[PDB]
Structures are given as structure tokens and as C-alpha cells.
Amino acid sequence: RPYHCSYCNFSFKTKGNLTKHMKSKAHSKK
Ligand SMILES: [Zn+2]
């Protein structure tokens, strides 16, 4: 999908959600 984590394979539906992943201390402060 046009929304795949920059690490995991957590495929979201929109930027808002995907951002929620990068938002938390997941792993993408870069
Ligand atoms: Zn991830």
C-alpha cells in the first residue's frame, strides 16, 4: 500500500495513521 512503515511492515491506510506510527517512539526519528 502507499503507506508502509519505514521499518516494520505495518501497512496503514492514510498519512494520518502512518504518521501515528512514526509519531510514537516507534523507530523513525530520521
Ligand atoms: Zn515501524
UniProtKB/Swiss-Prot annotation:
It comes from the Eukaryota. Induction: By mitogens and phorbol ester. A zinc finger (C2H2-type) spans 3-27. Contains two sets of 2 zinc-fingers, which are widely separated and recognize the same DNA sequence. There is a fifth zinc-finger in-between. Interacts with UTP4. This protein specifically binds to the DNA sequence 5'-GGGACTTTCC-3' which is found in the enhancer elements of numerous viral promoters such as those of SV40, CMV, or HIV-1. In addition, related sequences are found in the enhancer elements of a number of cellular promoters, including those of the class I MHC, interleukin-2 receptor, and interferon-beta genes. It may act in T-cell activation. Involved in activating HIV-1 gene expression. This is Zinc finger protein 40. It comes from Homo sapiens. The chain holds residues 2114 to 2143 of 2718 of the full protein.
